[PDB]
Structure formats: structure tokens, C-alpha cells
Write a protein that binds this DNA or RNA. Structure first.
Ligand SMILES: Nc1ncnc2c1ncn2[C@@H]1O[C@H](COP(=O)(O)OP(=O)(O)O)[C@@H](O)[C@H]1O
Ligand SMILES: [Mg+2]
Lengths: 754, 788
DNA sequence: AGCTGCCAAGCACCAG
DNA sequence: CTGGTGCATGGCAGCT
């Protein structure tokens, strides 16, 4: 009652689940905090049932809360970034731990996926790149120094963890890292001279190790993510492009929702990492392209088999951590049994990279056979109770089970002997913890129980008895069952000793298999959805013949209107007039997604695409202050290799201010930055730009008025727009006729000056 | 699939399927012994929803029947989970006696828990109404009716068009919505929770009239002012039928219905309710709302009333003057009254349970506690000079007789349920004391028998006990049980003990048990009798709770007016608003820096203000605070200014800026009058430069020329600052800002005339746009300024 | 104080 | 017809 307080002092920053019979119960500010986060009641007490702790842990873990469980003492802790149990994770989403800190120079950043051992490090130069890395990686738990000056970056996030500055010390970090990987220096990983990144990585690794209190043999590498390697996209751009998340917070009507028909959870997670990290290096890209074309035919044969491999990545983490439960080993075995078939289907594929994926996939004949012999066809969830080791694997175990079954058989025949011998049809032998084995007669017959029967328990409508004969065989049964259970466990632990020396090759296999899932999926998508392989050019350019928006074309059952685009150094900017209504916005967004998909190595939705090198993609599409802030970010960071998409800036202030800013932005983008730009606008005055300056041109969307409506066509045409539609839309909407007549008069007089 | 005709089924499932056929779309809890049972798909869904095992009930012919269930004593926890997810549940109980039934015992559905018909304290939120509504659409309009079942408040309206109806659904936010099958305007209603499609015949007018008249004890509905209102009666008739089928008892707290006419209140459109953040902020939460600031009531029933008032400003001048006078009269009495009023609690909802015959012992206890506060309240209120307050004091009643009854009937802190007894107090019923006397000369008797028999046998482990399964016993340990009297009759054997019975203990077992059941039966009969004695006074009781709720509300507005520095507004004959040193009641309490008070002068000669000023300058706030001040004035409340004079307002419209803007605008243009307050916040969107502005201009014209509404017109279009020149009624005001050096300061002060200039370039500059780009845009701007 | 397993009260089922 | 057995979740006896 009183001894909760002292144990809450031991871990004050973490929710304290306190065992109390059938529930775990929280008090003080833990009670308040848990009641609001879990839709359960306050009293200051709260509670959850034992049978569904893991179901409530996972929701608290999902919202950034660590949880200490007190069984007395704190015997378990789960932190949001360091879980690896399947019950606590989402199958198709990464769950990362991260660490951030700040020099007078710049930022250091590390992420770890504790289930795959995927360990990354980076060194963002400034505020904006740092924020872009946080949105992209979206860590479930975020370690930061007490020192941290730029709290604006992390303030709102879940799972913040304030750490002392000495956890970020260079030399401790190097030593910890060199020890984890078994190296003398980090040159082999290309991070030796990246001290900011390393300091973050040393804090992260220390915190991971302290949460597990176990070696982490699956974390054998770290890699550095350099800015120049990827197409940079800021938070706002990422969100607007609706890559994995839609604007409304969901996962549907998203690029992932269309491109992601992978068949294994590890493949779905890898695909989403690729979509969020397009790379500038055409070499990787052409190689992915070639794989996708080469696998076109083999797709229907590959995917059903690949689905049976399952989430080998996360199973392997539990092997590494030595928490892998029997059905984990059963599914690892099930995946090993897919490998030969997969190897046979891939043998033909004329593709150097598919053949490398084929080798790296491996076979593991020995381990397949080991687990075939070692474990039954479908074992229970836990080793705990046995019935998991297969008969014929250990001579000793088969013998103990035989002695148990033979004692148990004698007792069933004892039941039949005592029964027909006494003439009592209700007579039977049962078993429970309180009495072990007993003979049960019903009340009504119990008064004819033989006098040698020692009564031990009266029930409402039966009596139970023991005899020495019954207790003798109980001993045989329980001591046999008991040694067999201890043997099962020791044999199971030994499977871990035999499996674990092949961990490195096994992680290489699950990675290959995950990649194969991604590429085989993208191949099925390209072939299915009528995509085409884009080509790369030396100079900045985008030439698209009949491009579509990859999401909108699947998601609406209206025909989708494909469109050209021609951007070069000689034609760098299009001023897009006409109604928007989603037509311009869709056209600009589909441009960015074709760029993104090209630079992920996927085929693209078009008859043809040629595309030059892109460093960054900016899409300001969707207060005045925020439009202007995002515009400011484009004008400070865009280059002649950037793709810029602006959506009618100037809205939200005066006509002349709005037009002056738009004109000065359009001109800056065209003559100073020279970025490749689609500048959507409502200002007809801006269509005079092509005649004042080189490299700019007018396109537009039009609309046809028929019947009692107006069809907003989505066809992009050359030249400026020569009609507006605000008044036509107001008329349809029921604005009184006399008001529109007056608006039309007013419109003519305002426009006739300009 | 098995052909499961009637004859193929067992008597149990014959009975169950007849019952389920009367509740085909909703879960049925079927009482079978100690369990509520669900079958077939109900079992599978219950299993998913409630987290319970899906099992089977064996069958000799045909298929095995899917089953899930809960023991009867756990039912309330399970109904709560279901009601939270908007599920309805038919509760079916056993009526007959199994011992005198050859076949299955008789079973009826005795209630149906649905999201809008709950009245139990654990299933509701203290400070939020939970309404059942019904909606109906005509060739020409809407019928709508609401019921708060846990108060009896029954309302009827006839919104004339789509937007009024939308605004009504937003204001009332029904937890359950019964609608007619031929409803055409589904956009109003889909994606609403607790949606219940109903057959047309449930909205038939003669049936409605007939049921409502039957319910109220009347021949016609003339005295209620709804005889006139068949569109509304149809919705009300459906509602009343639903209420009666869910509760399956009489509903004597539903003694009245009232029509809500357009003219009796200020109709706020949907955008206005949202944009003023009355009880919900613009991100769905309750923080930083008008209610969060104004609502320091001390009773749940008063909290709800205050929110209903905030949502329905009244236009009756007399009612408003009375509330205003109450607020001034009571200002010194707030610190005294509030701690007492708090102790009354939620008498409203308790009397609902009383009416429903559902009230638990702690309900009658709290009702008794409330009666005990009435004397102290009467005394505090006699001194207060105010006819309205004295009217409430009298309405509040005293109920000395019923207070006395509950003090004699029930113990001080009774248990949660009457099921286990221990509720009725000593001395109230002599037959009950007489029965208690027997099952109580009990543990004194059993200790005596225990010591007597231990000392007589000389067996020192001998104890006396009870066990629900085997009854009373004499226990002796295993090692001493071979020494027990030969008289001792073996009753129950255990591992290390043996339990026995003797005739004297068996007789004492029979007398204690038959008398414990007799005492419980009589308690239950006396407690049901408590209802029969309270119920005849239900009308006055309901009026007392209403008074207490109003008192709570008004006392609160007094305290708020004092603490937050509000003054009494005055009303005038003609449309107009005159504010001196007015403030946004909510923004001024959250801002960490002083609030800049601002004037307003609207009148029939000065009825439209074009408001300019920079982005972040305070235009929206100024417009909102105007509406909030009107709103508070028209609930009787004092108001956040130094002085306010305001004429009659029929309706507040808001448009805060594609087909939706233009449709909303048209609605304002078709339905505004010279008595309407209209807030247009930066409207006018088109596809080209002037397209949208031209519409805003023509719209302003129509508002000034034809409608003559009091209109506040925030705009970024400088071209509209020319409107005063061209049209009577229109004037320019602006929010002051100063540009010193390289930067803008926002003064937040309204001044007459057009702003000096627009400030988009400066705002863009402040947002980080490169200096080089701001230089070039200034150059372009001066080209444009040289045109005119 | 923890863990296991009987029992509630209707009804149908199942062998004899 | 008889005398037995199954059957959800939660209460708590009975054993440790
Ligand atoms: N009278 C006032 N005194 C102090 N601050 C104010 C006042 N009115 C508005 N503000 C502040 O200025 C900010 C912007 O106000 P807003 O009405 O939205 O300006 P606008 O509509 O012109 O863009 C608000 O956050 C509010 O806190
Ligand atoms: Mg505004």
C-alpha cells in the first residue's frame, strides 16, 4: 500500500504499472496521464486487466510513453523506440529510436531500428535540413542533450528523453561504437571523420543497451546519410505530396497506398523508406530499373512464395535478442522452405542484380532440416508448457514422454477397472493442482464407494477420493512430464546456439528477400498500371509525354486526363493561369511525383519521361504568413537543379501587393535561381512575363460550359487563360441574378484598366 | 445451410428467435439463468466489441449455435462499452417462475439501451446534454424534435431550409437521430453518430397527435402551442414512440412539449457557432471557448443550462431585463450561495431516474441531501431585493415532508444497489426490524454453539462456518475428525478438514435463510413504495430543479460579471450596436499581454464597415468580439465592455473565406434582413485577378442597398475601400499598424477611415522572403500605384 | 497475498 | 423419464 511511493522515486519520469492481483494499477500523475491516453477511468487510481497488458502497453508505447512494470521490484521496462515484440509493433511501419544534438557548428543525428539493426547517422548543416530529417524519420523516441538550444525543432514530439551532455562525448562514443561492431576504427563504415553524427550515435547506442541489458549482435554496422545523395524534401513538401500520410492524417489516397502491394511486412517498410528517400545516383537507379523490367514476367510466380517468407527481419531480431518464441522459429523454418523454390524461379532472370539478390538470399539447408526435425508442425505460443520439440529429435525426451504416456494409460485403465468392478457408471478419474489425480463418483452413487477410498473433497453433486495406487501413478506421471519439460526447454535454448552463428548471413538473406519483395512489387505495378521506364539526362530538364498523377488516376472513377510537360534550361518556367479547382494543383503535384518515382528507381505513369538531375523538390501547393514563409524557404534554398511548384501566391493580401510579390518571385526563380518552375497563378497580369524575359512561357487550364453546368477540363494548353469562372460558379451556386449582373459590370471596369 | 424453420428449433431458440425478430438490427442480451447470452452474429460482434470469447451451444439437429455471454452482475460495465461505440442493446429478462413453467420461462424485452435514451449516471457526462432527436423532411421544409430523457425537456421546431436545419443539428448535437426513410437531404445527416433510419409510418401525423395527446393527458395540443405545427409533430410523434419502446414504462417526466420558433431566438448559422467557439474550439476541444471562460457554475444541471443559453440567445425583452436585474441584485451574495448550491448537485437527472423508477439508493440519498440545502438557500435569498429572484426562491420549493420521509426511510450512506439489502433504516417498518432481528441473533448464536461444541467435544480445531454451496457447518480438522460425535452428519469433506451438520444447526440455517429473504423482499417492496410516495410531487420537484439550475446559472453570471469586469448593456428600438471599450471575452483571458479595447458604432445610417488593416492586425477578432457581445447581451448576461447599446437582432451570419463559399454567401443574401448581423471575413474568391473581388463588391452592394443588414466586412481588397464613396450606409475602418524602419507593429486599435496603405510586402518581409525579392516587388508596386 | 478451479441458473444434450 | 454433463465471466473458497 505504502511501498509504491519509494519505487516511483526509482523511475519518476516513466509510468509505473503496479501489480495488484488481476490488474496493473497506476497512481498520482500516472493515473491522470493514463486515464486520458487510454479511455479508462480515474478514481488517484487507474487500472488495466492482466490478460491484455500487452494490448495497453502497445498503445502507451504508440503515444511516446515509456512504462515500468512492477511485479517487489521493477522487473520490466518498455520504451517506445526499443520494442521488438510483435505484439507491441505495427507490422507495416518502422519504429525508430533517434538521438539529436547541437554544436556551435551544426547538428548531429542518429537513428536505430532495433528490430533490423539498421543504424544511420547524419549531420544536417542547418535548422531546415534538421527538421526535414525529423519529419522523414519520425522517431518513436528521441534522445536530446539537456544542452539543446533549438528546442523549437523537437518541442511538440512524442517520446522525448532529456540526456546529460556526457552521453554525447566524442571518445566514449567512438569506443562504444568500435566495441559494438568489433572494429578498431570506423573507417570501414565511412563515418570516422563525422564526429557530430558519432556523438549522437554513441548516446543512442548506450541508451539502447541500457534498455535491453543484452548484447545486440544484430547491430553490426552504421551508415552515414549525406545530403548530396538524396533529393531533399522539407516537411511541408513531404506532407503535400502525400507519400505515406494523407493531409488528413490517414494512410489511404496516398502514393504508398497505390505503389505498395508488397507481400511481406519487411518489404512494405523498405518500399516506404525508398519513397521517402529518392537518390541522385543514377547508377543505383538504372540498376533498379533493369531489375524491374527483368522481373516483369516472373512476378505471378514469385509473389505467392515470397508471401510465405513473412517478416523474417523482425523474427531475426528476436533470435538475436534471444526472445524468439516457438512460432517465430516455425515461421523462420517456413521461410527456409521457400528459398529453393525462389532460387529456381530466379535462376533464369538475366539480370546481374537479381542474381546477386539470389545468392544473398541464401538457402540454409542445414538450418531448415534442423528445425524440421527439432520442432512440431504447429507449436503453441510459448515454450513454457512444452509440446514444441518434435518426437524423434532427442532419444531421452521420447523416452520420458513414453513413461508419462504409459503411466497415463494405466490410469485410464484404472478408471475402467474401478468402474465396472464397483458397478458405478458415474465413476471417473480426474486431475487438478489441489489434489492431483482423484477418483470422482457422483453424489447419489458416492455412498457405495469402496471403503478403501479416502475422501478428499465434496462438490455440490460429486465426491472425490484418493487411493495409494492413484497417488503412486501420479508420481510416475508428474516426474516424467516434468523432466520432459525441462529437456524441451534445454533443447530449445540449444536451437538458439546453433542458429545464432549464422545471424549475419541470415540478416543478409532477410534484407535480400525484403528488397526482392520491393522490386518484384514495383515490377508488377509498372506492368499493371501502364508505367514506362524514364531516361536520365545530363542537364536539368523534365520532358513528359502523357503523364498522369499516380494516385488520382486509381482513386477516382472519372477518366483521368494525361498531360505533357516540357521544361529545359531554355524553358524553365510555366505560368499556369485558368481555374484551379484541383486541375493545376494535380498537374503540379503529378510532376513532382514523377520526379520522385523516377529517382526511387521505379517506372513512372507516362508514355515517356526524360529527366535531368534534381537536388530538391519544393511544392508550395494547397494564412498568408505561412504561404510567405514557405515561399521564403524556396527562394533561399532552391538551385538551378531544383523543381519548384508554387500554387497561386498573393492570395490573402491586397491585389497590388499580391501581384508585386508574385511578379518578383516569378522573376527571381526565372533569372536568379533558374530553377525548373511551375508557377501557378490567378494574376492575368503575370502572363506578360514571357514577353519581358527569356525562358518563361504561358500555359493554362480551360473549362467548357454546357447544359446547366461547367466541366472543368484538366487539359493543359499553350498560352494564357482568356476566361474567368468565379461569376459562372456564383451563378450555379444561387447568388441572385442581379448581384452577378453587377459583379460582371464591375469586373469589366477593373480589367479594362490593365 | 440448415433449413431452420420454426419446428427445427428447440423451445429455447423458438423463444429467442421470436424475441430477436422484434430487434433484428440490434444486439439482444438474452437472460438465461445467471448470464446474458447472445447468439449467432450478435455473439460474433459482441465477442469483437466487448473482448469476450466466442463459443458454441451444442445442438442435436442442425448446426451448432455461436454464443457469447456475461454474468448478469457485470452487465453495466458491458453496456457502457457498447453505448460508447453507439451500439443499442435490447435487454431481455426472465419474467416467469422456472418451477411453474413446463417449457421455457416467459421472457420479455424490458428495455433497450440506446445512445440517446440513456439516463443512468455512469453512462452520461456530467456537464453535457445527451439528446435524442428525430428529423423529417417535407416537400417544403423540415420537422425536428429533441428530447432529453433524463430531464423530460421535449422541444419541436420547423427549420425552413437546409442551412437552418444544419445549424439546428450543430446546436443540439443529438447523440441519436431518428430520421425518416424518404429523407432527401442526406448530406445534413450522414457521418452523424447514432443514426437510426425509420419507416415513414412513424411520422404519420394523426398517430403523432394521438400519441402526444395520450402522453400529456390532453384532448388537443393547443395549450402547448404546437397544434399548429404538423411538420414538427411528425418528428415528435416518431421520437415519442422511440422513447416509449426503449424504456417500456410510463414516462411521467415527459409532461410537456414546446415549439422553438425562429422569432423567439437569435438564429446563428453553422459557421457562426463554430467561428465564435461557443462550446467547442476550432480544433474540436473545450479549451479556450466562451463557455470555458463564462462557466463556473457549481452544479452539472446549471452547467448544461448555461451552454443551452449560450447557444440560444433569447429575444423576449422582459425575460432579458429580468435576468440582467437578477445578476446585479445577486452580486454580493455569490460567495455565500455557491457552496450551498453545489451541495444540491444534479437533482435534474435524479428526478429523471425517479420518474423512470430506476433511481438507486444514493440517488434518493442525494435527493435528500438537496432538500436539506433548501432552507439555507431560502434564507440567503429572502434578503435579496429582486422580484425575479423571489420568483425563483418560491419555485425552488422546500419539500419538508419528503425530506423527512427520506431521513426516516434510508440510512446515511446506503450501498450502490438495493439488490443486497441494507438500504432501509431501523424504525421505518416494524415488520422489517422484526425480520432483521432474526437474521442477526446469528453470529452471537453461532459463536455460542461453536464454543459450546468445542468445549463439549474437547476438539480444539472445532469451528463454525458458512459456505454458500453447502450451508452452515461444524468444521473439525482431519487429524481430530475421527473423534467427532456419531451424531455429526457429514456434509462436506476437504483436504485437511471435515465439516458436519446437526439438527439444531440445520434448523438455525433454515430460519436465518428464510428470514434473510423475507427481509430483502420487504426492503425491496418498501423501496419501490418510496417511489409511489415521491412520484405524485414530480411536477413541483422538476420545477425546483429547474429553478436551482437557473439560480446556479444566474449566480454564476453575477460572479463572472464582477470578476471579469462586465457591465449591463441596454436595448434600443432600432437595429444598431454601440460599444465603448469592448473586448473579446475569451481572447483577453488567454493573451499574456493586455487586450486593446475598441469601439464600434453600427446604426441604420452606418450599417456596413469595410474593415481593412494588415494580416494579423485584429480584423477577425474585432468582428468575433462584436458577435460575442451581442450573444451575451441576448442571454441577459453582462458584457465585456465599458458601455453597450444594442438593438434587435434576428440572426447572425458568418462567412469566413469554390462552390461552398458561393453557396454560403447566397444563403446570407437570401435570408438576411435589416435586423441581421452579418460577418463577411475576407470573402471573394475567383479564378483570375478581379473575378473574386468583383463578386465581393456586388455582394457588399446588395447587403447595403437591398438587405440593409448590419454588416462587418473584413477585406484584403483595397479596392473595396472605395465603397463608402459610392453607397449610402457604408464606412471604412481599419486596424492600425505602424511601420518604423524595417518592421511592422500591430496596434490592434480600430480607427475610422481606410488604412493608409496595404502591408502585404511588409508581412512577407517579416516572414523571411529575401530582401532582394522585396526590393523588386516594391518597384513593381509603385508601377501599379502610378496607374491611378 | 497468489493461483486454480468450482459455481452461478437457466436449458439442451446425451446415454441408459 | 432419468441422472448426468456442458457453458461465456467474474466471485471467491480453498489451498499454498
Ligand atoms: N484587440 C486586441 N488586443 C490585443 N491583441 C489582439 C486584439 N485583437 C486581436 N489581437 C491579436 O492579434 C492576433 C491576430 O488577430 P486576427 O483577428 O486574427 O487578425 P486578422 O484577422 O487581421 O488577420 C490574434 O492572435 C490576437 O491575439
Ligand atoms: Mg482574419
Amino acid at each position: 500500500m505504502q511501498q509504491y511511493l519509494r519505487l516511483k522515486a526509482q523511475h519518476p519520469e516513466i509510468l509505473l504499472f503496479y501489480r495488484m492481483g488481476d490488474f496493473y494499477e497506476l497512481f498520482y500523475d500516472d493515473a491522470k496521464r493514463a486515464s486520458q491516453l487510454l479511455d479508462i477511468s480515474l478514481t488517484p487510481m487507474a487500472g488495466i486487466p492482466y490478460h491484455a497488458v500487452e494490448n495497453y502497453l502497445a498503445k502507451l508505447v504508440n503515444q511516446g510513453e515509456s512504462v515500468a512494470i512492477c511485479e517487489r521490484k521493477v522487473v520490466r521496462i518498455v520504451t517506445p523506440g526499443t520494442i521488438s515484440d510483435e505484439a507491441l509493433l505495427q507490422e507495416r511501419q518502422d519504429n525508430l529510436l533517434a538521438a539529436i544534438w547541437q554544436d556551435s557548428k551544426g547538428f548531429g543525428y542518429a537513428t536505430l531500428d532495433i528490430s533490423s539493426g539498421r543504424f544511420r547517422l547524419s549531420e544536417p548543416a542547418d535548422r531546415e535540413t534538421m527538421a526535414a530529417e525529423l519529419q522523414r524519420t519520425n522517431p518513436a523516441e528521441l534522445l536530446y542533450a539537456e544542452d539543446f538550444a533549438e528546442m523549437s525543432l523537437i518541442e511538440g514530439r512524442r517520446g522525448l528523453r532529456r540526456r546529460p551532455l556526457w552521453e554525447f562525448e566524442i571518445d566514449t562514443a567512438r569506443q562504444q561504437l568500435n566495441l559494438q561492431f568489433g572494429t578498431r576504427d570506423l573507417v570501414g563504415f565511412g563515418v570516422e571523420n563525422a564526429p557530430r553524427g558519432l556523438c549522437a550515435a554513441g548516446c543512442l547506442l548506450q541508451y539502447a543497451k541500457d534498455t535491453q541489458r543484452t548484447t545486440l549482435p544484430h547491430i553490426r554496422s552504421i551508415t552515414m546519410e549525406r545530403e548530396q545523395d538524396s533529393i531533399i524534401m522539407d516537411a511541408a513538401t513531404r506532407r503535400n505530396l502525400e507519400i505515406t500520410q494523407n493531409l488528413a492524417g490517414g494512410a489511404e489516397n496516398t502514393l504508398a497506398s497505390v505503389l505498395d502491394c508488397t507481400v511481406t511486412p519487411m518489404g512494405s517498410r523498405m518500399l516506404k523508406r525508398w519513397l521517402h528517400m529518392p537518390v541522385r545516383d543514377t547508377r543505383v537507379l538504372l540498376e533498379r530499373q533493369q531489375t524491374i523490367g527483368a522481373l516483369q514476367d516472373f512476378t505471378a510466380g514469385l509473389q505467392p512464395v515470397l508471401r510465405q517468407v513473412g517478416d523474417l527481419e523482425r523474427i531475426l531480431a528476436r533470435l538475436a535478442l534471444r526472445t524468439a518464441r516457438p512460432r517465430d522459429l516455425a515461421r523462420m523454418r517456413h521461410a527456409f522452405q521457400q528459398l529453393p523454390e525462389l532460387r529456381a524461379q530466379l535462376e533464369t532472370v538475366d539480370s546481374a542484380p537479381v542474381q546477386a539478390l539470389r545468392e544473398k538470399m541464401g538457402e540454409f539447408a542445414e538450418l531448415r532440416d534442423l528445425l524440421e526435425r527439432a520442432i512440431i508442425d504447429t507449436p503453441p505460443v510459448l515454450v513454457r508448457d512444452g509440446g514444441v520439440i518434435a518426437s524423434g529429435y532427442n532419444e531421452e525426451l521420447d523416452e520420458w514422454r513414453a513413461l508419462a504416456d504409459g503411466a497415463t494409460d494405466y490410469l485410464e485403465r484404472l478408471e475402467v477397472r474401478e468402474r465396472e468392478r464397483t458397478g458405478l457408471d458415474t465413476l471417473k478419474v480426474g486431475f487438478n493442482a489441489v489434489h492431483g489425480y482423484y477418483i470422482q463418483i457422483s453424489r447419489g452413487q458416492s455412498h457405495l464407494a469402496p471403503i478403501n477410498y479416502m475422501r478428499r473433497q465434496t462438490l455440490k453433486n460429486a465426491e472425490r477420493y484418493i487411493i495409494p495406487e492413484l497417488k503412486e501413478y501420479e508420481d510416475k506421471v508428474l516426474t516424467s512430464k516434468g523432466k520432459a519439460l525441462a529437456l524441451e526447454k534445454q533443447l530449445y535454448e540449444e536451437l538458439f546456439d546453433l542458429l545464432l552463428p549464422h545471424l549475419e548471413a541470415l540478416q543478409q538473406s532477410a534484407s535480400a528477400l525484403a528488397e526482392l519483395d520491393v522490386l518484384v512489387n514495383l515490377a508488377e505495378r509498372a506492368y499493371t498500371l501502364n508505367y514506362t521506364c524514364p531516361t536520365f539526362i545530363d542537364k536539368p530538364g523534365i520532358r513528359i509525354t502523357e503523364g498522369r498523377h499516380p494516385v488520382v488516376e486509381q482513386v477516382l472513377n472519372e477518366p483521368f486526363i494525361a498531360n505533357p510537360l516540357n521544361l529545359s534550361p531554355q524553358r524553365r518556367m510555366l505560368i499556369i493561369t485558368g481555374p484551379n479547382m484541383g486541375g493545376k494543383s494535380t498537374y503540379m503535384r503529378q510532376t513532382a511525383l514523377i520526379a520522385l518515382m523516377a529517382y526511387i528507381g521505379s517506372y513512372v505513369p507516362a508514355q515517356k519521361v526524360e529527366i535531368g538531375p534534381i537536388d530538391r523538390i519544393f511544392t508550395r501547393v494547397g494564412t498568408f504568413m505561412v504561404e510567405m514563409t514557405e515561399t521564403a524557404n524556396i527562394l533561399h534554398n532552391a538551385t538551378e537543379y531544383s523543381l519548384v511548384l508554387m500554387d497561386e501566391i498573393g492570395r490573402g493580401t491586397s491585389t497590388y501587393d499580391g501581384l508585386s510579390l508574385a511578379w518578383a518571385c516569378a522573376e527571381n526563380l526565372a533569372n536568379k535561381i533558374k530553377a525548373l518552375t511551375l508557377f501557378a497563378t490567378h494574376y492575368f497580369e503575370l502572363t506578360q512575363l514571357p514577353e519581358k524575359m527569356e525562358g518563361v512561357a504561358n500555359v493554362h487550364l480551360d473549362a467548357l460550359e454546357h447544359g446547366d453546368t461547367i466541366a472543368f477540363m484538366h487539359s493543359v494548353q499553350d498560352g494564357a487563360a482568356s476566361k474567368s469562372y468565379g461569376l459562372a460558379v456564383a451563378a450555379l451556386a444561387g447568388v441572385p441574378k442581379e448581384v452577378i449582373k453587377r459583379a460582371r459590370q464591375k469586373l469589366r471596369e477593373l480589367e479594362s484598366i490593365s
